[PDB]
Amino acid sequence: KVYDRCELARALKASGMDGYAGNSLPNWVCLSKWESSYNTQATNRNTDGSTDYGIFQINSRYWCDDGRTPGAKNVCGIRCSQLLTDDLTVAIRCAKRVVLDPNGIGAWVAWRLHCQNQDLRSYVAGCGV
Ligand SMILES: CC(=O)N[C@@H]1[C@@H](O)[C@H](O[C@@H]2O[C@H](CO)[C@@H](O)[C@H](O)[C@H]2NC(C)=O)[C@@H](CO)O[C@H]1O
């Protein structure tokens, strides 16, 4: 599913992402936009043999099992395929686990690049949330 920006903002807000581990909602909309263009089916293979999955582009070396990643740890305890559904429940639960690690939201390259220190007002403008 390719989410609409406000549609995605509402689903994140409904799921407790606004302020999760001190990360306001606009943070999460901004990184979803840059990481996958709001597409739950987005996949990106890395040089190291790992692959990034879904809306949040979660990596198969540490968080999920895709069965072809060398030295994989599967910390979210899921199949990477579960990160590609239109339904965001499992993706959200795993993104919540990812942000508890020491690096917080800096775990996401797109957040570090396009969102950190930025004015993120525009990502939720007009969503009425
Ligand atoms: C969103 C995602 O899947 N991000 C990735 C980062 O988690 C991953 O960072 C690595 O995360 C581990 C788990 O918290 C850390 O123990 C490890 O220190 C770490 N490393 C760094 C190098 O910042 C990176 C790199 O594997 O990949 C991103 O895809």
Brief synopsis:
The PDB classes it as hydrolase (o-glycosyl). This protein has 129 residues and is an alpha+beta fold.
Describe this structure in words.
By secondary structure, the protein is an alpha+beta fold. It has one domain (1-129): Lysozyme (Orthogonal Bundle). It is built from four helices and five strands. It has helices at residues 5-14, 25-36, 89-99, 109-115, and strands at 43-45, 51-53, 58-59, 64-65, 78-79. The strands form two sheets. Strands 1-2-3 form a three-stranded antiparallel beta sheet. A two-stranded parallel sheet has the order 4-5. β2 (51-53) and β3 (58-59) form a beta hairpin. The radius of gyration is 14 Å and the shape is globular. The two termini are 21 Å apart. Residues 58-59, 61-63, 98, 101, 103, 107-108 line the site of a molecule of 2 linked components (NAG-NAG). It catalyses: Hydrolysis of (1->4)-beta-linkages between N-acetylmuramic acid and N-acetyl-D-glucosamine residues in a peptidoglycan and between N-acetyl-D-glucosamine residues in chitodextrins. Belongs to the glycosyl hydrolase 22 family. One of its GO terms (biological process) is defense response to Gram-positive bacterium. The active site is at 35, 52. Its EC number is 3.2.1.17.
